[PDB]
Amino acid sequence: DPDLEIRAAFLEKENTALRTEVAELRKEVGRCKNIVS
């Protein structure tokens, strides 16, 4: 019964945070991929 209205909202905030973390990590790997070639 954990209020979907909330649950979903929570998931949204998590997801956006995640998509972000992935952004920064890709950037990081880009720099690494560059260092290598």
Add this chain to the structure above:
Amino acid sequence: DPDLEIRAAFLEKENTALRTEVAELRKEVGRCKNIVS
């Protein structure tokens, strides 16, 4: 009106998929961080 039951579920699948992408990305960075030191 986009059925929260659904929307939440969808977000969960997305979220897990993301957590995963982040996993692999971390691993990739570790390999890089190692190559550097």
